[PDB]
Amino acid sequence: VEGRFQLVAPYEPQGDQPQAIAKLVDGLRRGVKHQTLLGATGTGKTFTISNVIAQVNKPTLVIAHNKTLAGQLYSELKEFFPHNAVEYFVSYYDYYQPEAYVPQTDTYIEKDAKINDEIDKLRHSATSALFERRDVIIVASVSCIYGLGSPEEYRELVVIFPASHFVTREEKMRLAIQNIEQELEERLAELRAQGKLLEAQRLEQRTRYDLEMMREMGFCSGIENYSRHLALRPPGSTPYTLLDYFPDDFLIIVDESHVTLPQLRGMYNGDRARKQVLVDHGFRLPSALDNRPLTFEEFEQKINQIIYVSATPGPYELEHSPGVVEQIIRPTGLLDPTIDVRPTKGQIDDLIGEIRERVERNERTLVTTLTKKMAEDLTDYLKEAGIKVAYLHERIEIIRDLRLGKYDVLVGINLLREGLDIPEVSLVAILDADKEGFLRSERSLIQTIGRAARNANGHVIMYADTITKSMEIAIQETKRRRAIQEEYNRKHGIVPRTVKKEIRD
């Protein structure tokens, strides 16, 4: 035929993974814009989604919120399909300090960037493999909404492949520079005519120096700021991005959508706010604003067919989706934990009671508390009762020590950080379940409750004086989820057992 996906993995889809793959692979072909996978912390997800890719045969973009997370999605995917195109398009700066300017302290910070080649390599390999074959999975960070050169001009200038994504022809360069001088003479009159003589001197000096640099030696530092003039697109243009280097029938998989979609949304507003101060003071031309990441409007506007993957799918996902695609049943047959809501009335005494019993049956406990000194005031309080305890303000080793048994309890505050799916954790205690907050949001609770779903004796305790709506939802949702899981195990004769794992040195 041409190019197509070859799944590799020593297991078929079990759980309700098949049900989900069907419902998704369908909605895609059935011509559905958005789709939300509502899988449970500890189900198929990656395998489920790998299958949705290897049936529809589309070039896919996997967008993760953080890099560690992208590195695993890739790692796996570049092992799930060891004979296909799997790419890693993320930021390529070991260190980066954008050109800024603190107006109060009159502090112009300069641009300081430390490139990393190994990642730069992978970025070209992503954009170049995207034009060569039509079976490709690119695991991307949020840098995929940031600016890149027009994709026609990319391949429309190719022998074997360009070593830069922003390669502007020299008939253009000549015309562009003139357009820059012309903008400069305009801004300078505007500034100078509103009394901002100082700010016009700053601008004239920086821009003329760059303009010369360009004329002399084809480019200059901070060349980015002139990107639009160089691409000779009119003011206000929407940047070309990695999304544009994809076919029109490409797939988007936003992993951890409830945290990724917003991150991806916010980017633009942060950039503009800094650029605007530079523009306002003469550090830059107004056109520097057209060198930027996409607005979320522009991002959704470039989407072909997207699939939001989340245990706690956020508002946006649901609002623009035909219900969801639940994926509750775990291959292990494990259930969402059982939750108990108990008085704060001498809770710290009670909590020490339950933790004894966990140590007795060789089991671990995680505790979240709403504040940093509240936790410190617990860690000691548990040491008071002689209990091997930890605390989270190398770090991968303290959790590794937990699983091994150095510590019996691990106190924290945001247990939501990655690295806390210990299968040894039989108890998760949520202090201040009712005291409003982010970590006591309907979704934050549900995630934290999830930190009990690895162990077959998982149990959640919520310490509160009142039941909030938040509590009530997570509690009611978890109930429904355990009920469904428990009814499936009856049917398939499953007896849930903790997922066997170990740790290395």
Add this chain to the structure above:
DNA sequence: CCGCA
């Protein structure tokens, strides 16, 4: 997490 010496 982002960023065209």
